[PDB]
Structure 1
Amino acid sequence: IVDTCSLASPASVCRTKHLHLRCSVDFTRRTLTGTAALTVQSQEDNLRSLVLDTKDLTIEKVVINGQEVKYALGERQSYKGSPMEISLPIALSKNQEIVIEISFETSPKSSALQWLTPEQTSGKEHPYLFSQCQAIHCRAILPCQDTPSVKLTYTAEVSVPKELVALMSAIRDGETPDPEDPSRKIYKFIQKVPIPCYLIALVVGALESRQIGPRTLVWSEKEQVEKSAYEFSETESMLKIAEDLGGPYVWGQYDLLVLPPSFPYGGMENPCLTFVTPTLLAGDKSLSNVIAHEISHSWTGNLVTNKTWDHFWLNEGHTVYLERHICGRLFGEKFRHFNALGGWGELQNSVKTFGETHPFTKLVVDLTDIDPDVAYSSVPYEKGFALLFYLEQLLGGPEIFLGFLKAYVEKFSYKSITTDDWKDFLYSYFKDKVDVLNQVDWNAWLYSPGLPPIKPNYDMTLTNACIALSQRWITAKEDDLNSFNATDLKDLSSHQLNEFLAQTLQRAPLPLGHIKRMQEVYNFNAINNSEIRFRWLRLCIQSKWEDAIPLALKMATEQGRMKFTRPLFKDLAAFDKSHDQAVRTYQEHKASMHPVTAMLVGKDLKVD
């Protein structure tokens, strides 16, 4: 099967087995410079050339067997970058391995990287760099077969200014002063478990660590360590549950890195070092499902991997499925159902926003000539989850379906698979239930746009109070507003508060007087919980409350998680009173934003 997002030679032609990366980080030039040594195994007879992905890389030379070889860069193909063809000096037989050492330098404009000035950090004294390779940005750091169909181990040595610390998606393997430059340090890393390259990660900054479990340090700038250690304290208990459900955690360490506010995603499951947004820091551990999610990826995604990005739902549906099982183990089955139902609500929202015929409301997609970053949404997460929850109920319940899950992980560990591999295995595992599986509308579930053909069964117990309060507000007239009071919230958890706001946002706009009264009685402006504040601010802006404009602009820019930043900017652009402010604010912040987020918000706003 073809990876339409990669220009490199496919796995049927050759396979990278190992990367040795030696590089130096230059904050003055905003470049990573060094060598990438790829141990490549031929999958063909008489192999005489191969192609790697690159994007905005400067190649100095390519060395094989101690000598330079011929290579050429093809024309750039937009978001895919430029293909790099390398002429092998000796034809390779099948299964023969060689080492190809490429000397390269990244561009400042690397879409994989954000370079922060001291001013953009917590500490204000030192600059900061972080990577984000998923889906296809690893090629903007180093030449590689940038496709999740290929898995490799890696070792790395990274030279940085001595006042800073480097971390990677790997086990830390020592530091020393840089023997060539006393103003620098060299940090070493080893990743002994084979991984797709999208899992390669690097951060360099003024980082400190705190131990929070037997195999977990939290890393961040000093200003955030204390809050992060508390917020994620349940990590080890989640890892133990995850091991029970998925089998052995094979990666050794499970560290967490809390990035600066411009980190563009809730989390990234980089092996040995999950990256998360500081917008998780609600002060009460209430957004810890994101940690449960990233933990779960150590099985579904990092062990069993999607073969191409068209099959991304395999990564996300199964991970959300495991995530909600971890939460259910910790807080009860009724809570698992509460979050499952909330996820269905997010899928409804996506389908409504995209449109019920939109190609990216399909579960299995076709990314031919589409930038994965433009396609990305919560659909593969929630439509994928819905399919699995539906199957769980069809096939005899969670205990039975968890047996399939563990078997599936065992079966495909260290491999990259397609939707058919998954469905073939489902049928084999549940062969005594084929008659039931054969009545599943597979083509609709997998390939039709819109809401899925069947909605699962959800327990309503923790949801009822959220809907009831939302409905009171929606059905209230002016002469009913007096009856609302802070006592309304006294028995709602933060999770239920968030769901009340989600329910209400689905019916937005509300009358302006309603939203004013809400603030007057509940003081939602004072809540720092990022998920709650996000929905609250969207509700205010869509209901045309001008007072909320500065609050929404501030949330949109003072952090950069796209889940929040993109919709806030879009709501602000849609509101006539804030439109010009939204565009100008974007234009003022554009140069200092994450490159991917800057591109997407700019497209969202039609700024060019």
Structure 2
Amino acid sequence: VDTCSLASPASVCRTKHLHLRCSVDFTRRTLTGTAALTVQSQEDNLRSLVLDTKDLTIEKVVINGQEVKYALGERQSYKGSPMEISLPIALSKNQEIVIEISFETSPKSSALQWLTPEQTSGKEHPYLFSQCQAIHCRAILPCQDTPSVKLTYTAEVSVPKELVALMSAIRDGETPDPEDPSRKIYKFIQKVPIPCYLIALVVGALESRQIGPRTLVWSEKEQVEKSAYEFSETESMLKIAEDLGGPYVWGQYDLLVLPPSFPYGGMENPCLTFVTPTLLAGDKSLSNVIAHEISHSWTGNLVTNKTWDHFWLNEGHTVYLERHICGRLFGEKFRHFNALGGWGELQNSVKTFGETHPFTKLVVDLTDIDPDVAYSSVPYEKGFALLFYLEQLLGGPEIFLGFLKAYVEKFSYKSITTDDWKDFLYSYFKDKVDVLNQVDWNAWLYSPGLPPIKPNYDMTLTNACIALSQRWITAKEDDLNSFNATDLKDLSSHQLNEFLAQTLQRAPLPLGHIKRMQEVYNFNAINNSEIRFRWLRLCIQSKWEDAIPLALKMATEQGRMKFTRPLFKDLAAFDKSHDQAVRTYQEHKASMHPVTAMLVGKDLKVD
């Protein structure tokens, strides 16, 4: 049972295809059109079905060229409103029909962000982007909004002629709109069945540059050059991922670099990964996000979680594959460094929620929980830790990668649960069941807190980070003179980030220590978003008033939730900046991404 959906489940009926014909109106901030759903009955004598909707205006429902009766139920908070459709003729098992729904979105759709020209790089044209994961596809179009149903899709999108539309699909041409010469129609085809959270749309003043045989980078003109360089390793990563997961089935692998309010680091939209512009560090150091998004082309997009309670299947296996890609490119010591860093992020998430919090369980129960509120590093890192522990228990990376490839092959184009995964793990490792039976499954899968066992990690690249962090933590006023810019000479950007992560775990540090750190290391000059974020959190938690305008600027100039949420929270927790944090949120709220605005509001206790 998918407890996040109000629609008829997959056991009743299944959407096989969506044909979307829509028009984008920037003056009204609406998407208007028709969603033609090809539905297959799974039951005898089926006479009605229910779809998910959220803030949608429905004009009519057409089946067999005639209008049919439908009713929208009372709204169920974040789940939206169920839409019951009365079928004109009872359907037998396996019978298929086409249901054409004429709809319009609300300007406040939780799936969309409408940007004014002032919010874009070019300053001349507006911009629109979607973000359906987890349950926001229902805020764009009526659908069975559950990852347990997979469908193909075709779409025709009408937009003002000066703008470009892209979707999570293969581009199928453009023409002037035959109904309006001031507009263009962009066509799309997604021939591989996908869960509806993978439907995505962007409309804006977009330009492209080729960076690989199957990859274009898309962004506004101002970011194209920097993006092509930042993501130049994409093809090399795709070749490694194919070797690990089997064929890349999606055709194209394009990248879209969104405006700064994009709420996540990346979104694995098929054929067109969406990325935050905060990855544009200038040195490719944040490329693991591309490796992660590429990996989802197997773990998440091909093999999908049946319900959001099993989201760790998507994230845990993706982080596992991402870390193998980075390990192939940079070495096994680097894979262990990143894996150990991940354990640290898990420690942080567990400490933030509390060790008994239900959101720290690997398999969660999302009954009456908004998925956006439960979202965290837990499914990524606790999921990764489980797989890394199993890799060590089962004979190493080569052996465990054999399982990963077989798992992807077994469940391709399907939606599965934790029980399906565990059953297959036991089947594949039938000769190692004695070892598998030693795993504390109840603790790993269903208990809150840190996992019961911590994997073994090579420390080579981590040692220098820990040693420098410990020197600062144990330093007294008379030791401050010993620190110098030379302390960092042999540290990579990754190691500088880990040094800050280690130090931040012990924050606050004395104000004089943080002032000395700026004096000798000049961290204020670093633009790398990950390093800058950790440095500013360290400054604010250590009560440095000079950091207040820097932290407020980072929190608002970009909108990646990983950065924006903890920055606003740290600023609200610092007495000197509390009022400024609340006022800044109130002033920016109306122009923020709808999900980010909701979450920052909840974090700040501002309604």
TM norm. shorter chain > 0.5: yes
Give the superposition deviation at 1:461: 0.2
Give the superposition deviation at 1:578: 0.2
Give the superposition deviation at 1:60: 0.1
Give the structure 1 partner of residue 232 of structure 2: 233
Deviations 1:143-173 (A, max 9, x none): 0000000000000000000000000000000
Deviations 1:165-200 (A, max 9, x none): 000000000000001111000000000000000000
Deviations 1:65-98 (A, max 9, x none): 0000000000000000000000000000000000
- What residue ranges of structure 1 are gaps of 5+ in the alignment? none
Report the 3-state secondary structure (helix = DSSP H, G, I; strand = E; otherwise coil) of the residue aligned with 2:142.
coil
Give the structure 2 partner of residue 35 of structure 1: 34
Counterpart-to-counterpart distance in 2, 1:282 and 1:479:
36
Counterpart-to-counterpart distance in 2, 1:21 and 1:180:
17
Give the superposition deviation at 1:502: 0.1
Counterpart-to-counterpart distance in 2, 1:140 and 1:209:
29
| 1:317 partnered with 2:316 | yes
Give the superposition deviation at 1:419: 0.1
Counterpart-to-counterpart distance in 1, 2:570 and 2:394:
42
Give the superposition deviation at 1:457: 0.1
Deviations 1:578-608 (A, max 9, x none): 0000000000000000000000000100012
Counterpart-to-counterpart distance in 2, 1:223 and 1:78:
40
Deviations 1:213-243 (A, max 9, x none): 0000000000000000000000000000000
Counterpart-to-counterpart distance in 2, 1:552 and 1:507:
19
Give the structure 2 partner of residue 539 of structure 1: 538
Counterpart-to-counterpart distance in 2, 1:436 and 1:133:
40
Counterpart-to-counterpart distance in 2, 1:379 and 1:530:
22
Counterpart-to-counterpart distance in 1, 2:76 and 2:351:
32
Deviations 1:19-45 (A, max 9, x none): 000000000000000000000000000
Give the superposition deviation at 1:112: 0.0
Aligned positions of 1:355-370 closer than 5 A: 355-370=354-369
Deviations 1:282-320 (A, max 9, x none): 000000000000000000000000000000000000000
Counterpart-to-counterpart distance in 2, 1:28 and 1:34:
16
Deviations 1:354-405 (A, max 9, x none): 1000000000000000000000001000000000000000000000000000
Counterpart-to-counterpart distance in 1, 2:378 and 2:535:
23
Counterpart-to-counterpart distance in 1, 2:490 and 2:355:
37
Give the superposition deviation at 1:451: 0.2
Instruction: Give the TM-score taking structure 2 as reference length.
Output: 1.00
Give the superposition deviation at 1:422: 0.0
Report the 3-state secondary structure (helix = DSSP H, G, I; strand = E; otherwise coil) of the residue aligned with 1:83.
strand
Counterpart-to-counterpart distance in 2, 1:392 and 1:94:
43
Counterpart-to-counterpart distance in 2, 1:470 and 1:295:
33
Give the structure 2 partner of residue 343 of structure 1: 342
Report the 3-state secondary structure (helix = DSSP H, G, I; strand = E; otherwise coil) of the residue aligned with 1:53.
strand
Counterpart-to-counterpart distance in 2, 1:32 and 1:262:
20
Counterpart-to-counterpart distance in 1, 2:490 and 2:231:
24
Deviations 1:320-377 (A, max 9, x none): 0000000000000000000000000000001011100000000000000000000000
Counterpart-to-counterpart distance in 1, 2:282 and 2:266:
18
Give the structure 1 partner of residue 568 of structure 2: 569
Give the superposition deviation at 1:432: 0.3
Report the 3-state secondary structure (helix = DSSP H, G, I; strand = E; otherwise coil) of the residue aligned with 1:587.
helix
Instruction: Give the TM-score taking structure 1 as reference length.
Output: 1.00
Give the superposition deviation at 1:459: 0.2
Give the superposition deviation at 1:105: 0.1
Give the structure 1 partner of residue 580 of structure 2: 581
Counterpart-to-counterpart distance in 2, 1:24 and 1:391:
49
Give the superposition deviation at 1:100: 0.2
Counterpart-to-counterpart distance in 1, 2:583 and 2:172:
46
Give the superposition deviation at 1:113: 0.0
Counterpart-to-counterpart distance in 2, 1:180 and 1:143:
25
Give the structure 2 partner of residue 261 of structure 1: 260
Give the superposition deviation at 1:273: 0.1
Counterpart-to-counterpart distance in 1, 2:461 and 2:257:
31
Deviations 1:228-260 (A, max 9, x none): 000000000000000000000000000000000
Give the structure 1 partner of residue 501 of structure 2: 502
Deviations 1:426-476 (A, max 9, x none): 000000000110010000000000000000000000000000000111111
Counterpart-to-counterpart distance in 1, 2:238 and 2:485:
37
Counterpart-to-counterpart distance in 2, 1:305 and 1:353:
28
Percent of pairs identical after alignment?
Answer: 100
Counterpart-to-counterpart distance in 1, 2:335 and 2:605:
39
Give the superposition deviation at 1:10: 0.2
Deviations 1:125-159 (A, max 9, x none): 00000000000000000000000000000000000
Give the structure 2 partner of residue 224 of structure 1: 223
Give the superposition deviation at 1:61: 0.2
Give the superposition deviation at 1:525: 0.3
Counterpart-to-counterpart distance in 2, 1:357 and 1:475:
31
Give the superposition deviation at 1:521: 0.5
Counterpart-to-counterpart distance in 1, 2:370 and 2:567:
22
Give the structure 1 partner of residue 436 of structure 2: 437
Report the 3-state secondary structure (helix = DSSP H, G, I; strand = E; otherwise coil) of the residue aligned with 2:456.
coil
Give the superposition deviation at 1:203: 0.1
Give the structure 1 partner of residue 60 of structure 2: 61
Counterpart-to-counterpart distance in 1, 2:258 and 2:467:
38
Aligned positions of 1:586-605 closer than 5 A: 586-605=585-604
Counterpart-to-counterpart distance in 1, 2:180 and 2:478:
74
Aligned positions of 1:4-153 closer than 5 A: 4-153=3-152
Give the superposition deviation at 1:211: 0.2
- What residue ranges of structure 2 are gaps of 5+ in the alignment? none
Counterpart-to-counterpart distance in 1, 2:482 and 2:222:
43
Counterpart-to-counterpart distance in 2, 1:216 and 1:528:
27
Counterpart-to-counterpart distance in 2, 1:602 and 1:458:
38
Report the 3-state secondary structure (helix = DSSP H, G, I; strand = E; otherwise coil) of the residue aligned with 2:24.
strand
Superposed CA RMSD in Å reads 0.3
Counterpart-to-counterpart distance in 1, 2:184 and 2:458:
55
Report the 3-state secondary structure (helix = DSSP H, G, I; strand = E; otherwise coil) of the residue aligned with 1:256.
strand
Give the structure 1 partner of residue 374 of structure 2: 375
Counterpart-to-counterpart distance in 1, 2:349 and 2:274:
25
Report the 3-state secondary structure (helix = DSSP H, G, I; strand = E; otherwise coil) of the residue aligned with 1:499.
helix
Deviations 1:485-518 (A, max 9, x none): 1111001000000000000000000000000000
Report the 3-state secondary structure (helix = DSSP H, G, I; strand = E; otherwise coil) of the residue aligned with 1:61.
strand
Deviations 1:542-580 (A, max 9, x none): 000000000000000000000000000000000000000
Counterpart-to-counterpart distance in 2, 1:487 and 1:189:
54
Counterpart-to-counterpart distance in 1, 2:513 and 2:228:
39
Counterpart-to-counterpart distance in 1, 2:38 and 2:284:
43
Give the superposition deviation at 1:271: 0.0
Counterpart-to-counterpart distance in 2, 1:105 and 1:352:
43
Report the 3-state secondary structure (helix = DSSP H, G, I; strand = E; otherwise coil) of the residue aligned with 2:597.
helix
Q: Aligned residues, how many?
A: 607
